[PDB]
């Protein structure tokens, strides 16, 4: 998967998310694929209804399985609809976007700055 | 007749030298490449100065010889016939073509028109060797030759001894040690590999473990 990320470095921005970032992401923009049919979770009953087999029955259960890469991360992740984020509010912080993060750009792997960017876009 | 040198400054094509196929190339306008006391010994000229190209262009044989005679002349007329060894390290094997003007551009594959040398960036064009007492002179000679070329080229003093790959200190060490061996225009070095007897007949001064 790291090779995949390398193969798409100039079109995305990515990093290491913190517990706070993942929690706020699932809480505000976390939707599950239920018969595809994207559904806002909004209740631990939905998670239990589908991720129950793997032992996930709460929104925080999902968050934990995600943060700590778990034995059922593939299912817990493919169950979450791709988060639809809005453009960052405070801005991008750089003049041009399609330059690596190292070159005063926006794409590439900012290691922890991904959290600031996501929080600004969520 | 001779097309302006600007028409072939860049390496737009793949090397097209004289061959079994081209086979109708004119003679290179530059034929002598070693000038001065080319028979001198390496010890005779420790100083070496290079005229190195700072571009990726092509130099016509015409300009090549023109600059050669310019430089060599200045150098001799202010230094003396046997006061320097001027070697040119650029041989123009690239053949330039041309389309001689009731027809149009139908099948317009030219005929050889001239020769030129393809030089990279940082490639040495002129290599002159003298003794430090002449540096200013040979430098000015290469400077005057510079004007006969297209594209930036810079002069640089070599850290090596004359036309040898060893920096002066390393050469002094080896020679004042006993592993050097004069030759007509160049020198040979004592190797540690091969036949011991054939290695002792040559370089006999050495093995005394002293100068």
């Amino acid at each position: 998967t790291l090779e995949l990320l390398k193969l798409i470095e100039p079109y995305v921005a990515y990093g290491y998310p913190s517990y706070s970032t993942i929690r706020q992401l699932v809480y505000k923009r976390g939707f599950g694929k239920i018969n595809k049919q994207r559904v806002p979770l909004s209740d631990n009953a939905i998670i239990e209804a589908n991720l129950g087999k793997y032992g996930i029955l709460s929104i925080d259960d999902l968050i934990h399985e995600i943060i700590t890469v778990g034995p059922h991360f593939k299912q817990a992740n493919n169950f979450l609809w791709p988060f639809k984020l809005s453009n960052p509010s405070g801005g991008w912080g750089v003049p041009r976007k399609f330059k690596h993060f190292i070159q005063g750009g926006s794409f590439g792997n900012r290691e922890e700055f991904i959290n600031k960017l996501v929080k600004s876009m969520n | 007749a001779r097309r302006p040198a600007r028409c072939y400054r860049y390496q737009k094509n793949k090397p097209y030298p004289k061959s079994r196929y081209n086979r109708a190339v004119p003679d290179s306008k530059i034929r002598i490449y070693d000038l001065g006391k080319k028979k001198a010994t390496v010890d005779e000229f420790p100083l070496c100065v290079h005229l190195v190209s700072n571009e990726l262009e092509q130099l016509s044989s015409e300009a090549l010889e023109a600059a050669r005679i310019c430089a060599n002349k200045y150098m001799t007329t202010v230094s003396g016939r046997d006061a320097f060894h001027l070697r040119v390290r650029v041989h123009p094997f690239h053949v330039l073509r041309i389309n001689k003007m009731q027809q149009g551009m139908r099948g317009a594959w030219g005929k050889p028109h001239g020769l030129a040398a393809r030089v990279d960036i940082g490639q040495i064009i002129f290599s002159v060797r003298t003794k430090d007492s002449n540096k200013d002179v040979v430098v000015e000679g290469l400077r005057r030759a510079r004007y006969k070329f297209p594209g930036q080229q810079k002069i640089i003093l070599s850290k090596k001894w004359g036309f040898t790959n060893l920096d002066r200190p390393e050469y002094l060490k080896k020679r004042e040690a006993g592993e050097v061996k004069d030759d007509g225009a160049f020198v040979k070095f004592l190797s540690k590999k091969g036949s011991l007897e054939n290695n002792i007949r040559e370089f006999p001064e050495y093995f005394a473990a002293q100068a």
């Binding site: - | 011991l196 007897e197 002792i200 006999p204 050495y206 093995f207 005394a208």
Partner: protein
């Protein structure tokens, strides 16, 4: 090595060495390929060659099958084994080759199981025949004659060994135009002459041909034949008796312990010299630099 002929580094570098068994002028690969290679649709059935070689006056008869890791010998019979069966001198003669052929024939037949069956031809009248298959029975063992680099000439001992194996029972597809007694122009074979060669009629004829014309050469040539009181007349029977002895017992038993291999390994390692140490030659050259370049 005239200096005008020495080879250069480039010559040696760009030189391609042939196969070892070729550089030793021992294997004709262009022939080995066509003899060994087997029909790809059978896929394990080995092509058995009957290698017959000639040392200087000693016959070798092995039955081999090739393997990617190395030819494996099924049966082996050396003509030097003839004393056991009844022959003492010249085990290079056509009759010796035929003897070894018949020997290996019966030896392998017994090692296989086709001993009582496929007994070959016993009353050898010197006829041209091949070991035919048995009605409603296992087909005979088939082997192909490997003469190596031998030059195929009409009437050679290699073909004599061939006749011996075929007469023994092995199925060796073969013609008759290279058997002693073959008429060059007219297409007829002389079985009287072939039988003669099978027994020694030419060697026996030579014996009684020299016995009354030159006793001065018969003196040493054939010396043993006299040292053992036996003239030409006898020869046919010594061979025939050997034939009966071989057909009766093809057993091959080997040589006695006789100073066993570990002992041999020791008494030969004494003469086997082992390579020197790198430091050894390092000092061996340092001593030379001191003794030669150091002003004596």
């Amino acid at each position: 090595a005239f200096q005008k002929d020495a080879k250069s580094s480039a010559y040696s570098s760009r030189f391609q060495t042939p196969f070892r068994r070729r550089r030793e002028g021992k294997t004709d690969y262009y022939q080995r390929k066509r003899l060994v290679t087997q029909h790809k649709a059978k896929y394990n059935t080995p092509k058995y060659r009957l290698v017959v070689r000639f040392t200087n006056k000693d016959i070798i008869c092995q039955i081999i099958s090739s393997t990617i890791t190395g030819d494996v010998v099924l049966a082996a019979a050396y003509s030097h084994e003839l004393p056991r069966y009844g022959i003492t001198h010249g085990l290079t003669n056509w009759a010796a080759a035929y003897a070894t052929g018949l020997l290996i024939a019966r030896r392998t037949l017994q090692k296989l199981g086709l001993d009582e069956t496929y007994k070959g031809v016993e009353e050898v009248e010197g006829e041209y025949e091949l070991t035919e298959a048995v009605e409603d029975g296992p087909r005979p063992f088939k082997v192909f004659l490997d003469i190596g680099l031998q030059r195929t000439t009409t009437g050679a001992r290699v073909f004599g060994a061939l006749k011996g194996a075929s007469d023994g029972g092995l199925y060796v597809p073969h013609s008759e135009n290279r058997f002693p007694g073959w008429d060059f122009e007219t297409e007829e074979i002389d079985p009287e002459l072939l039988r003669s060669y099978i027994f020694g009629g030419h060697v026996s004829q030579y014996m009684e041909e020299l016995a009354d014309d030159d006793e001065e050469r018969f003196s040493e040539l054939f010396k043993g034949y006299l040292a053992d009181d036996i003239d030409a007349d006898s020869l046919e029977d010594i061979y025939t008796s050997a034939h009966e002895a071989i057909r009766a017992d093809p057993a091959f038993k080997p040589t006695e312990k006789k100073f066993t291999k570990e002992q041999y390994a020791a008494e030969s390692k004494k003469y086997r010299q082992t390579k020197l140490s790198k430091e050894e030659r390092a000092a061996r050259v340092a001593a030379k630099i001191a003794a030669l370049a150091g002003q004596q």
